Amino acid sequence: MNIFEMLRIDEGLRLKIYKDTEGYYTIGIGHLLTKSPSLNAAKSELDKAIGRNTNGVITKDEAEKLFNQDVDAAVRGILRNAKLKPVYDSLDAVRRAAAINMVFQMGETGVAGFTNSLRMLQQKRWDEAAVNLAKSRWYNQTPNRAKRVITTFRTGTWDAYK
Ligand SMILES: [Cl-]
Ligand SMILES: [Cl-]
């Protein structure tokens, strides 16, 4: 297992514009297009993302291209962030994937708000971080996915994904 296979399980793949769990226009493997309620705004963000006139539909290759860019961008957002970077550097390879998963889902500013959890993760107090991570809107809105990510931070194994 790796970050790509993990996110593909958590996000799914849809080739036509859809609404994510928050009601936002999204496509592909969790690629958010726009928070605006306008499907025409989404279609235009989508054409710009893909570089052609899509009419709300993309191919699987195109979905995987956006996915690669979004994973790369998430990693780069962690390393550029003064609060996320030292935590990520301290973590083993499996838990690093859990951090990327969170940034991918909620953005670098969202994750950097988990100040107490990040501190416990840095200190390798795994059971305590897992408890604190769950006291969150994140966990209450998407409990099954959040549980899988929290288990990954708690154990340092891919067990929740197999
Ligand atoms: Cl893009
Ligand atoms: Cl979920």
Side-chain angles (χ1 to χ4, degrees):
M1 168 86 32
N2 57 63
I3 186 58
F4 287 95
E5 294 178 19
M6 194 199 197
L7 284 165
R8 171 71 185 75
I9 284 162
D10 287 334
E11 298 288 355
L13 166 74
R14 302 186 67 185
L15 299 185
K16 166 77 229 234
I17 294 179
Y18 63 95
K19 295 196 181 148
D20 73 4
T21 65
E22 302 291 321
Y24 300 136
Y25 294 119
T26 303
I27 194 142
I29 304 155
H31 183 80
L32 166 79
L33 291 161
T34 189
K35 299 200 193 159
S36 158
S38 165
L39 176 64
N40 288 303
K43 288 186 172 212
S44 152
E45 289 296 308
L46 183 61
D47 289 350
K48 167 165 71 80
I50 297 300
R52 74 184 174 74
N53 226 110
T54 64
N55 201 34
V57 181
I58 65 171
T59 71
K60 187 183 181 74
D61 291 2
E62 288 172 336
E64 289 182 346
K65 190 179 203 170
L66 296 174
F67 184 40
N68 288 316
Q69 289 168 176
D70 292 345
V71 175
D72 203 44
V75 177
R76 288 184 287 100
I78 286 158
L79 304 175
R80 280 195 282 96
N81 187 294
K83 282 76 183 278
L84 299 177
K85 181 167 179 298
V87 180
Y88 181 90
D89 278 346
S90 86
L91 293 176
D92 58 279
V94 176
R95 306 195 167 81
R96 281 182 187 173
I100 305 171
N101 193 310
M102 293 193 65
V103 172
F104 185 101
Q105 176 181 9
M106 74 194 88
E108 103 175 48
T109 312
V111 187
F114 278 65
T115 299
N116 297 318
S117 293
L118 297 170
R119 193 175 76 244
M120 289 164 225
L121 289 170
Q122 198 162 358
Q123 304 176 81
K124 311 197 180 287
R125 285 160 139 97
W126 309 123
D127 281 15
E128 296 147 72
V131 170
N132 184 274
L133 285 162
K135 301 187 179 152
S136 59
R137 183 194 191 261
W138 172 56
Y139 178 92
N140 289 105
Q141 297 302 127
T142 52
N144 292 356
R145 192 231 189 100
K147 285 168 196 170
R148 281 194 294 274
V149 176
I150 292 166
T151 292
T152 305
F153 275 129
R154 194 185 44 88
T155 66
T157 69
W158 294 111
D159 297 349
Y161 286 89
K162 300 176 296 216

